[PDB]
């Protein structure tokens, strides 16, 4: 037989599916996934890096005026400056003074850091689903990577698990991704060939090795002076080195439920959000007929501790009769509680405990043991510590959950004055029978 | 404060620290005074007093 279920989308909880199956002996599994990782698409916009300004030593006419050469350069900046004075070793380096002229040019290209060091504004968009999970199988823990297509199912020990379609259609991305060596930030980028003055992205690359650069910087040069042989420019700001100041907090520290953020290649790990539905097909090679199962009768359920806390809440313990010696399991008929253990060895006339947990304090369920039903009931008390380092999703109970003879309590409530207003309405219809004949 | 879905905390360089709260102590009974209401201030507060 096959079965489709939905857990719970959360990591380190397990969860009790069972398989009950007409005329066999029933079987229970458990889900404990370890790893979903949400895998977006890649798509690369551009690569950024720090720039280069180079400039050559500056041409000197003196006795001249010099003049530019117009060149497709990345930021070509040229100026010829006239009543300059240079000073040297032997003092200015030309003949006469006030006709010494300077040609100089500027222009930018990228560095050596842009080989192994560079940011990466990204276009990603909706996701795949890849996971990693453990089930316990007649007691066999069992490993599983599988994608959550619907396809990449997965055959183990007669078994076939298909895990997805994910019904969480949320991601922890946007359409916009910068990723920097170590973290990526949900960011907004300036588009390819429009850098702003003043933020990484100034320049801008397609591929690591494109020679072509776009550049938007404004290297504008300034006067030298007289003895000051050099090259004096308006400074281009970068892009990186007050970036990697005003990085704000990546996104490993702002997710929303607590998404991790991994690298090469970049992925969500751990995304806890809603749920996925999970489909077994099992044969029939691994049942057993109920002639070969040892059934139990004569159960008596009690209750002695229970706690209603996030932990192993209670232990009850129910009396059994076996009739041979074997294997079988258990399960509750109520999503409120859960239970621990799966299968219970018995022998004979014995009885046996189990640990459970829940949160209605009035604890009112019934218990599938062995294909047998036995109904149990009890009061449980609030734990007596407030915080700890481990959820169990049995507390996640709505607003019909059960209150204790409270419910008796808010029934001696609702008493009601329907009685004595029907009265009054049996009181003025007897006046109005007076003559009430014919309405 | 600690929200009922939980928090997480991460200090320095070190490791993260998770956070979850339990139903938390205490309050009333299930008594003889009726009094099941500052249970009620242990489980889940602030809304459902809109309910009495
Ligand atoms: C060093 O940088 C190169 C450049 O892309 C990268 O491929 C490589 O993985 C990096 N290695 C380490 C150890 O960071
Ligand atoms: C299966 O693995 C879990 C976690 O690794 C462990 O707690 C449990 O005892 C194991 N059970 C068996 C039967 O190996």
Not at chain 1, 55 to 64: A, M, Q
Not at chain 1, 81 to 91: H, N, S
Not at chain 1, 305 to 316: N, Q, R
Not at chain 1, 386 to 406: C, E, F, K, M, R
Request: net charge negative; proline share 7%.
């Amino acid at each position: 037989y096959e079965h489709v279920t939905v857990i719970p989308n959360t990591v380190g909880v397990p969860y009790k599916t069972l398989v009950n199956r007409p005329g066999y002996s029933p079987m229970v599994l458990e889900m404990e996934l370890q790893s979903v990782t949400l895998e977006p698409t890649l798509s690369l916009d551009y690569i950024t890096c720090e720039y280069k300004t180079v400039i050559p030593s500056p041409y000197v006419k003196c006795c001249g005026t010099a003049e530019c050469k117009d060149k497709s350069l990345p930021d070509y900046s040229c100026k010829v400056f006239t009543g300059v004075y240079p000073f040297m070793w032997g003092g200015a380096y030309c003949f006469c003074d006030a006709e010494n002229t300077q040609l100089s040019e500027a222009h930018v290209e990228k560095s050596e850091s842009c080989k192994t060091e560079f940011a990466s504004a990204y276009r990603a968009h909706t996701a795949s689903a890849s996971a990693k999970l453990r089930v316990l199988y007649q007691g066999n823990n069992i490993t599983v990577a599988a994608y959550a297509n619907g396809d990449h199912a997965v055959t183990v020990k007669d078994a076939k698990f298909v895990v997805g379609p994910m019904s969480s259609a949320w991601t922890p991305f946007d359409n916009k991704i910068v990723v920097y060596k170590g973290d990526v930030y949900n960011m907004d980028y300036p588009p390819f060939g429009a850098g702003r003055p003043g933020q990484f992205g100034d320049i801008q690359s397609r591929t690591p090795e494109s020679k072509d650069v776009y550049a938007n910087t404004q290297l504008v040069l300034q006067r030298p002076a007289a003895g000051t042989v050099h090259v004096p420019y308006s400074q281009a700001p970068s892009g990186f080195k007050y970036w990697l100041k005003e990085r704000g907090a990546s996104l490993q520290h702002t997710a929303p439920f607590g998404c991790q953020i991994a690298t090469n290649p970049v992925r969500a790990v751990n995304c806890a959000v809603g749920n996925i539905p999970i489909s077994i097909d099992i044969p029939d090679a691994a049942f057993t007929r109920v002639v070969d199962a040892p059934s139990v009768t004569d159960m008596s359920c009690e209750v002695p501790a229970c706690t209603h806390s996030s932990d192993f809440g209670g232990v009850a313990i129910i009396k059994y009769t076996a009739s041979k010696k074997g294997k079988c399991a258990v399960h509750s008929m109520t999503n409120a509680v859960t239970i621990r253990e799966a299968d219970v060895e018995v022998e004979g006339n014995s009885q046996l405990q189990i640990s459970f947990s829940t949160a209605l304090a009035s604890a009112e369920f019934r218990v599938q043991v062995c294909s047998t039903q036995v109904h149990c009931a009890a009061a449980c008390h609030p734990p007596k510590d407030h915080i700890v380092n481990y959820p169990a999703s049995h507390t996640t109970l709505g607003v019909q959950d059960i209150s204790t003879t409270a419910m008796s309590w808010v029934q001696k409530i609702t008493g009601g004055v329907g009685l004595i207003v029907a009265v009054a309405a049996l009181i003025l219809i007897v006046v109005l029978c007076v003559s009430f004949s014919r309405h | 404060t600690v929200p009922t879905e939980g928090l997480e905390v991460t200090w320095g360089n070190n490791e993260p620290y998770k956070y979850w709260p339990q139903m938390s102590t205490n309050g009333t009974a299930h008594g003889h005074p009726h009094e099941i209401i500052l249970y009620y201030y242990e489980l889940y507060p602030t809304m459902t007093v809109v309910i009495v």
